[PDB]
Structure formats: structure tokens, C-alpha cells
Amino acid sequence: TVAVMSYSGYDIEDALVLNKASLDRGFGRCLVYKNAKCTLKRYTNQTFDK
Amino acid sequence: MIIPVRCFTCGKIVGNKWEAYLGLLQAEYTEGDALDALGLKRYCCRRMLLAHVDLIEKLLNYAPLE
Amino acid sequence: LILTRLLVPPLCIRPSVVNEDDLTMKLTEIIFLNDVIKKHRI
Amino acid sequence: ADFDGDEMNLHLPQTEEAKAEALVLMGTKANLVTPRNGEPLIAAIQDFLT
Amino acid sequence: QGRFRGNLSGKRVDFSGRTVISPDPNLRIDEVAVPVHVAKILTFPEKVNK
Amino acid sequence: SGSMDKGTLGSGSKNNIFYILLRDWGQNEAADAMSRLARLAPVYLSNRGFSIGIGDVTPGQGLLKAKYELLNAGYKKCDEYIEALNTGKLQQQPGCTAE
Amino acid sequence: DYVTSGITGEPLEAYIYFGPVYYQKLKHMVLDKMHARARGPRAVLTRQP
Amino acid sequence: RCPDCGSTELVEDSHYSQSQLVCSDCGCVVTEGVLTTTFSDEGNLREVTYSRSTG
Amino acid sequence: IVQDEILAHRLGLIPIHADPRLFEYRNQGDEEGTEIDTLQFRLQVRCTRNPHAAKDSSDPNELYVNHKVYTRHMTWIPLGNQADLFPEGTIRPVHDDIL
Amino acid sequence: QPMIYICGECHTENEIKSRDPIRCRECGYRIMYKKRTKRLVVFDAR
Ligand SMILES: [Mg+2]
Ligand SMILES: [Zn+2]
Ligand SMILES: [Zn+2]
Ligand SMILES: [Zn+2]
């Protein structure tokens, strides 16, 4: 729900104002997923990681 | 994924409207008549149900089950 | 102005893994060719 | 700068001499006019003109 | 990437930070707002005296 | 008298009021006045209200008639020039050949 | 639309253009870009950060 | 062993970006700073089998 | 399928039917709380296949039982002497339909 | 006592506790997932 107006002067050069309560009600919520991995391998000599 | 509980803009409870909305649509209503029947007046609230995509139904088909 | 010796640069300006830096490869191939020509002329 | 996702760097001088030189020669208040022809650069901007 | 262009004439320094920028018209024209997180990392060595 | 605009507040040129302050009374006065303006203008404007809408860009009525007449006149004139050229009647402007 | 101010409680002096627009959030976030260095590892060939 | 208090409770620890070896009982710093190769040379790595490197 | 953080956020927004004029603000720390400044609910549901399902194997409302978690599965857990002061049925979620 | 990995296809509990190569006990699948933790975790509903 956008309103096109000048307000508070914290929106001068393409910055924009966001309503706090909408953010508290789930507006713009997001999830970030990241992955890590490891390998255990057997060497030529009969020895291995553990 | 799943219907949000409260309308973002004004804080009205819309989380309990999804099943009723689908039922009224199933009765050959139109979206306007269904939304007015449920009592959602402010257009900041009608978009909460008119523009929802129910991904949980499709996601659960890939979920593990016995 | 005509060269007959070369200073091999110190280790610190050519780290352990470039495994080793290419200047080391050039130096080793030069010395290899030197040994080849020496023994072959003899 | 225009606040469309831009980034800026920042340095912290580690000496009293550097501090004094930065403050006296690079101060913002001492650089209100550009040296090309002596015209102001730091003045009001959009939405302060309106 | 040679020595003269890349290393001697311009080089990397420490005690410096980078971040996005945003507006704040409640400051003077000679102040900048620094996050508390970055204030805790950069350090200035003060000599002790009377 | 007058009303303030880019030529008297903006970073264009001299006659800027902050420039006058800087040159006649010092750096501190200009730096103070800039912050005073930056704090005062938003309080007025954000409570007065100022917006742009589609109504501000919809064309008027008489503009449509004027544009229609202008388009017709220009197209007709162009057609007569091309007519003059293709039959050779066109007078060659004394700076270049006909094209 | 006729709009009433929320700080002063008094009507505004111009009708405000109001309505819904589709907004999308890009992948760039400030939390992933804040970075600062005081002292740390240095290269081997040239002892620079 | 910590040269200042002689205790053996040395712990390897890094501050925000600075790696160091700190006596966990008196706060002394015994060794700080590391020198590590970067990507600019990471792209150039070759291989020589040691058997080859040994003749 | 719902993540823990999203699920907790969703549970945060459910209005409760207690009277806030009979409780005090919880002091800083003391996460345990006590009977004078907290309420407790317990949610516990498990989904299982319906033993009496027909062969249609097509309607989710018949294949499974407790496949939808509504807000009516939350049970008030009295704490301290609250069981006497608040008569049965006064402490509950307001709406009872929220999915 | 031995630890349980859930098979990725039939979801039958399997115990390995050895260097035995990964493979399900009932089906042929070769992917396993750890069970959820038993400790409780506290979240803020904000
Ligand atoms: Mg930009
Ligand atoms: Zn609403
Ligand atoms: Zn010590
Ligand atoms: Zn299996």
C-alpha cells in the first residue's frame, strides 16, 4: 500500500520509508540457506580419515 | 507458502478465511461476491486473500510419508 | 655486458607453491641443459 | 552518491600528525567551493528546494 | 599487475572499513554516523599522559 | 521580495545565499545555516503534503485541438517539400544539394 | 484521496495519490556487506594485507 | 609456556580478524600475525611428483 | 514442513482472551516467570493415516486424521492457583479457526 | 545404543556404527539422513 508523497526528508535520493508494524506482521520476511560439506577418503596406504 | 494470520497493513485477522473463501468459490460465486460475503471491506485486506498462492499443498507432495 | 654467471633470486621472492614457482622451473631446466652440454661435449 | 545501493570506504588515520593534516586541509567546512572555478558545491538539494 | 602500477604506487591498507550508505538529515555537514559494530573493530592508539 | 529557488539555494553558482554567508561572515555561519534549513524544510513540507498523480499528466482539451492542427500543418508542409523535390521544382538551398 | 496527518492530527493541504503496487525485494542486504578490518593476515610475496 | 607468568595455559585464539597465541591466565600475547598465500597465486599452482623432484 | 522460526512467528500473532488488567509486567531476566505475570499453553498433535479410509484414496479429509493443525488444539495449562481464580473456559485463544 | 540414520527412500531406521559402506537394509537406496535432536530449543515469537 504505497503513498506517493514527500515525508520526513529521510527519503531524498531514492531512499524509501517502511511501516514498522507491517514488518512486524511479516511483510518482506525472508529465508537464507547455506551449505557446508566434507569428505572422508581412504589413502593408498591402508589408512583413512575418521 | 501458507496463508498469513494477519493483514499486513491494518492488522485484521484473515488467517481463518482461507477454507471459507475456497468453499464459496466452489459454489460458483465470483471473487467479488465471496470477498464481500466474508466481510473484508478495506482493499488493503482484499488483496490478502485475492492474491495468495497456496504452495504448501504442492510442497507436501514432495514431503516424506509412509 | 655479456653474461657467464647468474644470481639465483632468494627464496623469499618466490614462495613455496606457485608445486613451486615457474622461475624455479626455468632455473632447473637451465641447469639441466648445462649438465647435458657439459657431459656430452666431454 | 545517490543511495541506490552504493557503498563508501572509510579510513582511520593512526597518528596525530595525520589527524591534524586531515582535519585542517581536508575538512568539509574548508571545502565548500570547488577549486575548478570557485563555485559552491555543497548547497541545498532536491526536496529542500521545494 | 606489475610492481610499479599495482604495489608501489597504490596498495592495500588496514584500519579501514566498507559498508552501504543511507541518508540522515539530522547531522551537521561535517559528521558521519558509524555503526557500533565497526566502532568496536577499529582502534586508535592513545598515548597515556597527565 | 522574491521566492527561493535553485539559483539562490542550489549548488549552481554565486548569488547563493550560503556563498554570501561564507564570503562575508565565515565558514561556521554557512555550516550552521545549512543544518538549520535541513531541519526546518522537512517539518513544513511533510506536514503540508506534496504529491504527483496521473491527473497531473493527463492532457487538457484545447491541447488536443492545438496538437491536431499542428500535426496536420507540419505533415502537409513536408508533403509539399517532397513534392517540390521529386519533380525537380524544389529550390536548392545554397549550402548543400537537394537531399 | 483526502488524507489526515498522523503527527499533527490535522488534514493535509493536498490530496495524496494512494494505492497498491507490486514490490519485489532484491538479494542485496546490508548484513552481508558490512566489513571492517583493524589488523590481520598479510600476503607472503609482498607483505601487504 | 607463557614468558610472563610461566603458566602453560596458552590458547590459540583469533580476534575479529587477528590470529594470535594468548596466555589464558595473564592475557599476554606471545605470537601474532600470519603470512598466507592468496587467490592471485592460488590460480597458478602446479604439481610435481616428489619422486620426480627426487630424481 | 514449517520452519521453527516461521512457526513461532505465526504463533506470536494469535490473540489471547485473557484480561490484561490482572497481570503484571515480567521483570528483566527471570525467564521462568510465575503465576502472577505469565500464562502457559501446550500444543501437541500427531498426524496418522485413517484406518477406516475407503478405497477412493483421493480426499485428504478422509485419507488422514489430524492433517490440519488449527488453533483449537492448544490446551491451557493452569499454573499456581490460576485454576481457581479464572473459571473454566475464560482463558483460551479468541478465534478457534486460525490455521 | 547404536545411532540411527533414516533411509532417504523408504524411511526405515538403519544402524551403522561401523565403516560399513552406506546402503539401506530393505531397499537399495544409498542416501541417509540424521534424526532430529532430542534437546529442546527456545525461540522468541517475534
Ligand atoms: Mg547509485
Ligand atoms: Zn487490512
Ligand atoms: Zn601468563
Ligand atoms: Zn531404504
Side-chain angles (χ1 to χ4, degrees):
Chain A
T1 313
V2 317
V4 174
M5 71 181 261
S6 287
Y7 176 91
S8 84
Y10 280 78
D11 64 349
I12 290 286
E13 289 260 288
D14 319 88
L16 47 82
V17 179
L18 302 178
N19 184 357
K20 191 187 171 192
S22 301
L23 267 57
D24 295 346
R25 288 167 189 137
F27 181 74
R29 199 68 58 124
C30 64
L31 307 168
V32 173
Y33 280 110
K34 279 193 180 185
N35 161 69
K37 73 182 178 74
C38 158
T39 61
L40 309 174
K41 67 197 303 182
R42 164 201 301 211
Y43 304 103
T44 75
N45 317 305
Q46 295 306 319
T47 47
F48 41 78
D49 313 278
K50 68 195 296 182
Chain B
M1 220 215 299
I2 181 168
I3 185 79
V5 177
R6 290 194 191 209
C7 159
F8 301 148
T9 306
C10 69
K12 179 177 178 68
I13 307 276
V14 316
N16 66 19
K17 305 280 190 263
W18 189 234
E19 316 291 316
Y21 178 78
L22 291 180
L24 267 46
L25 273 183
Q26 220 200 33
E28 311 302 343
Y29 280 65
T30 56
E31 287 77 350
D33 290 336
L35 289 167
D36 314 332
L38 292 169
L40 284 160
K41 298 166 53 50
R42 293 186 285 280
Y43 73 85
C44 85
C45 298
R46 298 167 76 89
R47 84 195 165 69
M48 287 292 309
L49 280 170
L50 188 60
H52 178 229
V53 310
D54 209 18
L55 279 165
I56 198 162
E57 211 76 0
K58 304 287 185 172
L59 287 180
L60 286 164
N61 280 351
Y62 293 78
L65 74 82
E66 319 320 324
Chain C
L1 209 163
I2 310 327
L3 57 75
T4 175
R5 282 195 239 279
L6 288 86
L7 286 145
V8 288
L11 273 289
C12 326
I13 72 153
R14 42 163 177 145
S16 64
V17 185
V18 53
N19 254 334
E20 327 299 309
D21 58 278
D22 61 354
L23 294 193
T24 308
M25 300 338 162
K26 198 60 50 184
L27 264 47
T28 77
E29 102 176 337
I30 288 184
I31 166 60
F32 155 81
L33 212 167
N34 255 1
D35 190 2
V36 152
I37 198 184
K38 179 276 298 181
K39 76 92 182 185
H40 172 287
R41 183 166 64 78
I42 284 177
Chain D
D2 50 17
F3 315 136
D4 63 31
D6 280 17
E7 291 158 87
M8 296 201 61
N9 309 346
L10 168 140
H11 306 101
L12 178 66
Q14 294 289 328
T15 308
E16 287 84 356
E17 298 192 278
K19 272 181 63 173
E21 297 207 2
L23 178 63
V24 176
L25 298 153
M26 293 211 234
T28 301
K29 285 204 299 185
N31 290 50
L32 269 50
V33 305
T34 186
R36 187 178 67 240
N37 64 3
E39 288 168 327
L41 273 184
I42 297 174
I45 210 73
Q46 79 180 50
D47 208 336
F48 302 154
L49 299 174
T50 313
Chain E
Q1 299 315 341
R3 294 287 96 79
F4 284 127
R5 267 281 174 79
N7 301 161
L8 286 166
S9 270
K11 58 186 76 164
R12 289 186 184 281
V13 305
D14 48 7
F15 303 96
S16 65
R18 191 178 169 102
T19 300
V20 188
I21 54 158
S22 90
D24 188 348
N26 282 330
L27 299 178
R28 288 182 57 93
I29 75 161
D30 50 48
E31 294 187 313
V32 72
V34 174
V36 168
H37 313 86
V38 173
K40 286 190 198 176
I41 297 170
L42 311 181
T43 55
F44 187 96
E46 291 276 9
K47 286 174 175 64
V48 182
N49 66 8
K50 290 183 181 183
Chain F
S1 68
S3 64
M4 297 292 219
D5 56 16
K6 187 181 183 183
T8 307
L9 291 190
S11 63
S13 64
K14 289 96 172 195
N15 314 328
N16 178 304
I17 185 61
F18 304 118
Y19 188 84
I20 300 309
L21 282 166
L22 161 64
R23 282 293 164 226
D24 297 353
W25 303 98
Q27 304 169 346
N28 299 313
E29 295 309 341
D32 296 350
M34 272 178 217
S35 74
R36 284 179 193 132
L37 170 68
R39 287 193 59 84
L40 190 138
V43 178
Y44 174 80
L45 180 62
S46 76
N47 278 323
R48 182 196 182 279
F50 181 66
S51 182
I52 188 183
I54 194 159
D56 304 316
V57 85
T58 199
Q61 281 294 124
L63 166 60
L64 301 172
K65 291 182 178 183
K67 182 187 169 181
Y68 163 100
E69 180 61 9
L70 284 163
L71 282 193
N72 276 352
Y75 286 7
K76 189 56 46 54
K77 282 287 309 301
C78 291
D79 224 299
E80 313 152 341
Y81 286 129
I82 297 168
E83 158 56 55
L85 161 53
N86 61 23
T87 55
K89 187 61 170 67
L90 171 140
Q91 181 252 6
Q92 182 174 343
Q93 197 282 338
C96 54
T97 189
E99 292 71 27
Chain G
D1 287 330
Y2 166 99
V3 170
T4 300
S5 193
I7 290 157
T8 47
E10 291 164 356
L12 300 189
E13 292 194 77
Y15 312 111
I16 304 305
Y17 198 56
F18 216 95
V21 180
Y22 198 75
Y23 254 85
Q24 64 197 336
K25 192 193 175 194
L26 308 187
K27 79 168 219 290
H28 298 276
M29 308 169 200
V30 75
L31 179 60
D32 286 351
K33 296 183 181 292
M34 201 203 97
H35 170 240
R37 165 169 177 125
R39 189 160 49 216
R42 293 187 140 61
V44 195
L45 179 59
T46 48
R47 256 67 135 189
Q48 287 178 6
Chain H
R1 281 166 60 92
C2 170
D4 198 24
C5 296
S7 63
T8 194
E9 306 280 18
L10 301 201
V11 301
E12 279 283 1
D13 164 59
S14 60
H15 208 26
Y16 288 100
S17 62
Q18 165 180 298
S19 46
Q20 55 186 10
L21 177 58
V22 180
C23 165
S24 68
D25 209 354
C26 80
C28 173
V29 179
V30 311
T31 292
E32 179 266 313
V34 292
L35 308 102
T36 81
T37 185
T38 180
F39 322 151
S40 66
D41 315 338
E42 183 64 31
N44 294 180
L45 309 195
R46 275 98 168 281
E47 196 276 348
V48 200
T49 61
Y50 301 105
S51 62
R52 171 154 52 260
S53 301
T54 58
Chain I
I1 284 287
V2 194
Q3 296 99 342
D4 305 347
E5 294 132 295
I6 304 306
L7 173 67
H9 172 234
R10 287 178 69 76
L11 287 185
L13 302 185
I14 291 171
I16 308 298
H17 194 272
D19 183 356
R21 307 197 306 281
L22 294 101
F23 298 86
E24 274 180 349
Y25 282 92
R26 195 191 279 196
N27 298 102
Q28 318 337 337
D30 60 276
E31 187 256 19
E32 59 270 38
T34 185
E35 66 157 37
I36 193 52
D37 61 13
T38 206
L39 295 171
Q40 290 193 329
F41 294 82
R42 147 170 292 289
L43 177 78
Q44 182 173 37
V45 293
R46 164 181 260 281
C47 185
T48 60
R49 321 174 80 72
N50 178 8
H52 300 305
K55 186 58 223 172
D56 81 277
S57 72
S58 62
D59 164 67
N61 208 74
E62 199 147 23
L63 272 308
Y64 319 117
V65 68
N66 281 337
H67 66 307
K68 276 168 190 325
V69 188
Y70 291 116
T71 190
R72 68 183 158 78
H73 300 160
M74 319 197 317
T75 61
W76 179 48
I77 280 302
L79 172 43
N81 280 105
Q82 291 170 358
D84 320 310
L85 189 39
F86 299 117
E88 173 59 287
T90 52
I91 305 291
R92 55 169 198 279
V94 180
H95 270 284
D96 168 83
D97 304 278
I98 297 165
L99 181 72
Chain J
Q1 192 70 308
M3 261 176 48
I4 306 325
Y5 301 163
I6 276 179
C7 171
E9 172 40 16
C10 62
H11 309 76
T12 56
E13 289 199 340
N14 293 172
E15 36 270 54
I16 312 305
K17 211 199 187 289
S18 312
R19 208 84 198 293
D20 158 6
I22 305 293
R23 150 185 50 196
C24 183
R25 179 162 51 75
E26 268 51 42
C27 70
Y29 211 57
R30 311 280 276 214
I31 316 291
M32 321 278 275
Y33 297 98
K34 285 185 67 71
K35 285 182 66 170
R36 204 187 187 277
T37 193
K38 300 68 168 173
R39 295 162 46 161
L40 93 174
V41 289
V42 189
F43 292 97
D44 261 26
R46 285 173 151 268

